[PDB]
C-alpha cells in the first residue's frame, strides 16, 4: 500500500506491440523503399510526457518574453537591419517548420513499426510547435518593434517577391513532394542536420550581436527539440539499409536532396547574415565550410557509411559555387527591392572594408556597383532610380532557375556563370547548373513553377505591389525600402513616377 505510479518508459516498453497485422496495413504513399517492420525509436515517450516537457520549455520562453524582455524594451533595442532580417528569417523558417508538419505526418504513414511511427509523431507535434514559435517572433516584433510592417503580414506580402519561391522549394515542397524517403533526406538527413540545427544556433548569435534577445529566447528553445528530429532522420536510413532497393536509390536521392538544400540556403543564409546585420559574427565562407564540409560532409556522412551512405557527388561543385553566391544574390535582392516585404541597406564604409577583407575582390566587383547605385540616388525617392534599370542599361538579364527558383545573372555573377536555355513543347526553360538541369530533363512534370517574370509580364511595377498589398497602414508608403533610415520612405506613387514594366527575359531568345 505504498505510493506508486507509472512513467513514460514503462508504457513505451509495450508501444511497439500496439500495431497489428492485416492485409491493407501498408503506407498510402508511393516509395521505392521498404521501412523495416521492427525498427525502433531513440526516445521512449508518450503523449502525456511529451506535452509536459514541451510545456515546461514554453513557461520559460513566454515568461521571458512577456515579462523581463518586455520591461527591457528588447523588441525595440535591436539594430534596424536585423529587425528587417528577422521578418524574413522568422517567417521563412515558419513555413519550413509548417511543411515539416505534413512531412512528418507522411513519414509517420510510411513507417510500419509502431516505434518508428511514434518517433515521427513527436516531430509532427514539434513542427506545429515550431510553426507557432516562429510566428510568435514576428508577432512579438510587430507588437513591440520599430517596424511592424512585414512582420505583421509576411504570410501574404512574401508572395510579392522572388526569394519566397525558392524557400517553398527547399522548406515546403522539398519536404512533402516526392518519395517519402527523398522527402526525409531533404528535411532531416540534410535539411536539419546540415543546415537547420547549426543555423538555428548561428541565428541566435547574429541576433544577440545585433541587440535581438527575442530570437535567442525562442530559437534556443526550438533547438532543444532538434535532438529527436536527428534521431528520426537517422532511423529512416537504418529502417531501409537492409532493403535491396536502398543500394540502388539511396545515394541518388541523397545527392539530389543535398543539392536542393544547398542551392538555396548557401546563398540566402549568407546574404541574410552578412547583409542583414550591422555587427558581424563570422564570415559566411568559413561558417559554410565548417557546416557542410566538416560537421556534415565528413562527420555526419561518415557515421552513415555503414548503411551504404556515400558523400554527395555534387559536393565539389557546391563548394566552387558557394564562395560568391550570397554576394551575387544580394545584388539581385537589392536591385529588386520594391518586390519585398522588408527594408534593405547598402553596405556602409565599415562593412565594405569587412567584405573586402574577408573576400578579396569584393570591392572591384560588388563594391563599385553599390557605389554607382548610391551615386544614381538609389536611396532617394526623387532620384527616379531603381537598380533594376542599371541591369537593363548594361545588358545584364536576370533569370529564374526553373527548378530552384533562385534568381541569377550569369553575365555578372562571380560564382556560377552558366546558363542553359531549352525549349520544350512550346515553353522556354532557364537553368543555372548541371544538377538542376538533370532534374528537370528527367522530371519535367515535377518542375512547372511559374516565375515572377512570367506572372508579372506586361504589368507596371506599382500595380503589382498594390494588388498584393505591399503597402504600410497609411495606404501609400511601401513596406519595402532601399534604405533603413526613418525618413524619406518611398511611396507607391514614387514607383509609379518610374513607369517600370516587367518583361520576361527569356522571350528574347528565338
Amino acid at each position: 500500500r505504498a505510493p506508486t505510479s507509472v512513467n513514460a518508459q514503462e508504457v513505451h516498453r509495450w508501444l511497439q506491440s500496439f500495431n497489428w497485422d492485416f492485409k491493407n496495413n501498408r503506407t498510402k504513399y508511393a516509395t521505392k523503399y521498404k521501412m523495416a517492420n521492427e525498427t525502433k525509436e531513440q526516445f521512449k515517450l508518450i503523449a502525456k510526457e511529451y506535452a509536459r516537457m514541451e510545456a515546461v520549455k514554453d513557461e520559460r520562453q513566454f515568461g521571458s518574453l512577456q515579462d523581463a524582455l518586455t520591461r527591457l524594451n528588447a523588441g525595440v533595442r535591436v539594430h534596424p537591419k536585423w529587425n528587417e532580417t528577422m521578418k524574413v528569417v522568422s517567417n521563412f523558417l515558419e513555413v519550413g517548420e509548417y511543411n515539416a508538419i505534413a512531412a512528418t505526418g507522411m513519414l509517420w504513414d510510411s513507417a510500419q513499426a509502431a516505434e518508428q511511427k511514434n518517433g515521427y509523431l513527436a516531430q509532427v507535434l514539434d513542427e506545429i510547435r515550431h510553426t507557432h514559435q516562429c510566428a510568435y517572433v514576428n508577432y512579438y516584433f510587430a507588437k513591440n518593434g520599430q517596424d511592424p510592417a512585414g512582420h505583421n503580414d509576411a504570410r501574404r506580402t512574401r508572395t510579392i517577391g522572388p526569394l519566397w519561391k525558392g524557400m517553398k522549394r527547399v522548406f515546403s515542397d522539398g519536404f512533402i513532394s516526392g518519395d517519402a524517403v527523398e522527402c526525409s533526406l531533404n528535411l532531416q538527413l540534410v535539411g536539419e542536420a546540415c543546415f537547420t540545427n547549426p543555423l538555428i544556433v548561428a541565428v541566435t548569435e547574429w541576433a544577440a550581436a545585433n541587440g535581438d534577445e527575442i530570437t535567442p529566447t525562442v530559437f534556443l528553445s526550438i533547438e532543444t527539440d532538434e535532438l529527436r528530429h536527428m534521431a528520426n532522420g537517422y532511423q529512416t536510413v537504418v529502417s531501409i539499409a537492409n532493403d535491396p532497393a536502398s543500394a540502388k536509390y539511396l545515394n541518388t536521392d541523397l545527392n539530389n536532396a543535398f543539392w536542393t538544400q544547398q542551392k538555396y540556403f548557401t546563398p540566402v543564409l549568407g546574404m541574410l547574415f552578412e547583409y542583414g546585420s550591422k555587427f558581424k559574427v563570422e564570415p559566411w565562407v568559413k561558417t559554410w565550410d565548417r557546416w557542410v564540409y566538416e560537421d556534415w560532409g565528413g562527420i555526419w556522412i561518415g557515421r552513415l557509411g555503414k548503411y551504404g551512405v556515400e558523400s554527395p557527388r555534387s559536393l565539389k561543385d557546391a563548394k566552387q559555387d558557394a564562395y560568391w553566391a550570397h554576394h551575387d544574390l544580394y545584388l539581385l535582392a537589392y536591385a529588386l527591392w520594391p518586390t519585398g516585404f522588408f527594408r534593405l541597406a547598402l553596405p556602409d564604409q565599415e562593412e565594405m572594408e569587412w567584405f573586402e577583407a574577408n573576400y578579396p575582390g569584393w570591392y572591384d566587383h560588388y563594391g563599385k556597383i553599390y557605389e554607382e547605385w548610391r551615386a544614381r540616388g538609389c536611396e532617394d525617392p526623387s532620384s527616379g532610380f531603381i537598380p533594376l534599370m542599371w541591369f537593363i542599361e548594361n545588358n545584364h538579364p536576370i533569370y529564374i532557375d526553373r527548378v530552384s527558383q533562385v534568381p541569377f545573372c550569369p553575365s555578372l555573377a562571380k560564382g556560377a556563370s552558366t546558363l542553359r536555355v531549352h525549349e520544350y513543347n512550346g515553353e522556354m526553360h532557364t537553368f543555372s547548373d548541371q544538377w538542376g538541369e538533370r532534374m528537370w530533363l528527367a522530371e519535367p512534370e515535377r518542375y512547372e513553377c511559374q516565375n515572377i517574370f512570367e506572372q508579372y509580364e506586361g504589368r507596371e511595377l506599382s500595380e503589382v505591389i498594390a494588388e498584393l498589398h505591399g503597402l504600410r497602414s497609411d495606404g501609400k508608403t511601401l513596406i519595402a525600402q532601399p534604405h533603413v533610415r526613418g525618413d524619406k520612405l518611398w511611396t507607391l506613387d514614387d514607383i509609379k513616377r518610374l513607369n517600370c514594366v516587367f518583361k520576361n527575359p527569356v522571350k528574347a531568345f528565338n
Binding site: 500500500r1 505504498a2 505510493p3 506508486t4 505510479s5 507509472v6 508504457v11 509495450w14 497489428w20 491493407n24 496495413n25 498510402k28 504513399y29 503523449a47 502525456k48 506535452a51 509536459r52 514541451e54 510545456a55 528588447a74 525595440v76 533595442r77 539594430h79 513555413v95 509548417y98 505534413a102 512528418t104 505526418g105 504513414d109 509532427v124 506545429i128 507557432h132 510566428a135 508577432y139 507588437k143 520599430q146 517596424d147 511592424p148 510592417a149 503580414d153 504570410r155 508572395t159 519561391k165 515546403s172 513532394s177 516526392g178 548569435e205 550581436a209 545585433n210 541587440g211 555587427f279 512534370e445 515535377r446 518542375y447 512547372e448 513553377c449 506572372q455 498589398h469 504600410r472 497609411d474
Partner: protein, 388 residues
C-alpha cells in the same frame, strides 16, 4: 570569466549606442497587430488566429489561398504538394475553420501536461489509500486487463487513421485540429496501457504484457467487427476528410461512446472500480473537445458553406451511410461481451436504454446536422441482434 566573452548588443555599451543611434524616433508603422488582415471569427482577433491562419502557403487555386502559382517541386507524376484532388469536399475557403477551444500548440501541451502531472498525483494517492482492495478481482483481471485492454488497439487504430490528414489537410486551422484529434486518441490508448501497468505494480500476478489484450483484439469475437471497421477507416480511406468525418462523426460517436461510456464507465463502478473511470473521464473530456472542432469544420464551415452546402451534405450523407453499417456491426459484436458478465450485472432493458442514449445523442449532435435520416429503433434493433 564572470562576464563571459561574447558581447551582446542589448547590454554592451559600445554596441548598444551604435544601435540606439540608428533607431527611428518612432515606429515606421502604427499597425502593430500581426495577422491584422485576417477575418476574425469572434469580436476581436485572437492570438490563436494570428499565430495560425495562413501559415499554410496555399495559392489562390486551393480555396481561400493568398499565394499564386504552382508549387516549386511536385511528386513524380505531377501530383501537387497540396491540392483539391485529395478530398471530395469543396468550400469557398479552407481557412474558415476555427477550433472553438482556440488551441494552438502552447495551450494544447499545457493542458495535457496538467492532466499528466495530476494523473501521477492521483495514482500515488490511489495506491497509498489502498483502494484497490475493494475492487472485484474478476472485473479487474478479466474485464480491465483483457476487454478494456483490447480497446486500446481501437483508439490506436483511430489515431493512425489521422496520419494521412496530417499530411493532406488543406489549411493550417484544419491541420492543427486534426493533428490534435489524433494525438488525443493515442494518449487514450497509452492511458489504457498505463492503467494496466499500474495494476501490475499494486496487484500481485497482474501481467502488464499486451499479449492478452492484443490477442483479444486480433482474434476475439467481441471486437471483431470493431477491428474490421478500424482497419478500414485507417487503411482503406485515402480522403482526409472522409477519414476524420467518419471516425469522429460516425464510428467513434456511436461505437466509442457506447464502449467508453455505456459499458466501462457505466459498469466499472458496480465492481468497486474507481480507477478506470478516472481515465475514462479524460477520454470523455477529449471526446467532447474534439466534437466541437469536428462540428465547426464539417457542419458550420463545410455543411453550411454558402456555395457548396448542398454538395457537402450529400457527400457527408453518403459517408454516413457507408460507415453506419460497419459501425452497427461493431456494436453488434460488442453485445457479446454482456453474456460474459457475472449474472445480475445488468439486463436487456438497461443495455437497450444505454444504446438509445448513444443513438439519440448521435442523431442530435451529428446526423441531423446534415439531414441524414436515421431511424433510432431500426439501428438499435439491428445491434440488439448481437445479444447472446
Amino acid at each position: 570569466s564572470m562576464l563571459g566573452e561574447r558581447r551582446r548588443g542589448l547590454t554592451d555599451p559600445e554596441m548598444a549606442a551604435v544601435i540606439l543611434k540608428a533607431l527611428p524616433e518612432a515606429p515606421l508603422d502604427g499597425n502593430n497587430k500581426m495577422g491584422y488582415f485576417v477575418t476574425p471569427r469572434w469580436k476581436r482577433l485572437t492570438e490563436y488566429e494570428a499565430l495560425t491562419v495562413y501559415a499554410q502557403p496555399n495559392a489562390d487555386w486551393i480555396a481561400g489561398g493568398l499565394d499564386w502559382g504552382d508549387w516549386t517541386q511536385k511528386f513524380h507524376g505531377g501530383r501537387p504538394s497540396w491540392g483539391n484532388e485529395t478530398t471530395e469536399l469543396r468550400t469557398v475557403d479552407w481557412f474558415k475553420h476555427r477550433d472553438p477551444l482556440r488551441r494552438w500548440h502552447a495551450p494544447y501541451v499545457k493542458d495535457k501536461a496538467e492532466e499528466w502531472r495530476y494523473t501521477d498525483r492521483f495514482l500515488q494517492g490511489y495506491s497509498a489509500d489502498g483502494q484497490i482492495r475493494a475492487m472485484n478481482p474478476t472485473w479487474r483481471d478479466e474485464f480491465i486487463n483483457r476487454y478494456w485492454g483490447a480497446f486500446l488497439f481501437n483508439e490506436y487504430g483511430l489515431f493512425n487513421a489521422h496520419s494521412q490528414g496530417a499530411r493532406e489537410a488543406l489549411s493550417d486551422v484544419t491541420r492543427v485540429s486534426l493533428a490534435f484529434w489524433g494525438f488525443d486518441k493515442i494518449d487514450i490508448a497509452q492511458m489504457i496501457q498505463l492503467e494496466r501497468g499500474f495494476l501490475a505494480k499494486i496487484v500481485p500476478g497482474f501481467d502488464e504484457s499486451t499479449a492478452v489484450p492484443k490477442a483479444e483484439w486480433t482474434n476475439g469475437e467481441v471486437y471483431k467487427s470493431a477491428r474490421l471497421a478500424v482497419e478500414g477507416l485507417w487503411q482503406e480511406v485515402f480522403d482526409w476528410n472522409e477519414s476524420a468525418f467518419s471516425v469522429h462523426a460516425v464510428y467513434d460517436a456511436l461505437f466509442g461512446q457506447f464502449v467508453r461510456r455505456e459499458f466501462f464507465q457505466r459498469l466499472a463502478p458496480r465492481f468497486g472500480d474507481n480507477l478506470t473511470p478516472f481515465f475514462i473521464n479524460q477520454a470523455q473530456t477529449y471526446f467532447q473537445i474534439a466534437k466541437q472542432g469536428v462540428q465547426d469544420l464539417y457542419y458550420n464551415c463545410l455543411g453550411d458553406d454558402p456555395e457548396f452546402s448542398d454538395y457537402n451534405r450529400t457527400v457527408m450523407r453518403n459517408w454516413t451511410g457507408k460507415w453506419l453499417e460497419p459501425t452497427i456491426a461493431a456494436l453488434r459484436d460488442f453485445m457479446g461481451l454482456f453474456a460474459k458478465l457475472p449474472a445480475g450485472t445488468t439486463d436487456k432493458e438497461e443495455i437497450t436504454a444505454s444504446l438509445y442514449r448513444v443513438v439519440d445523442d448521435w442523431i442530435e449532435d451529428y446526423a441531423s446536422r446534415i439531414d441524414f435520416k436515421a431511424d433510432r429503433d431500426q439501428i438499435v434493433k439491428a445491434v440488439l441482434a448481437g445479444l447472446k
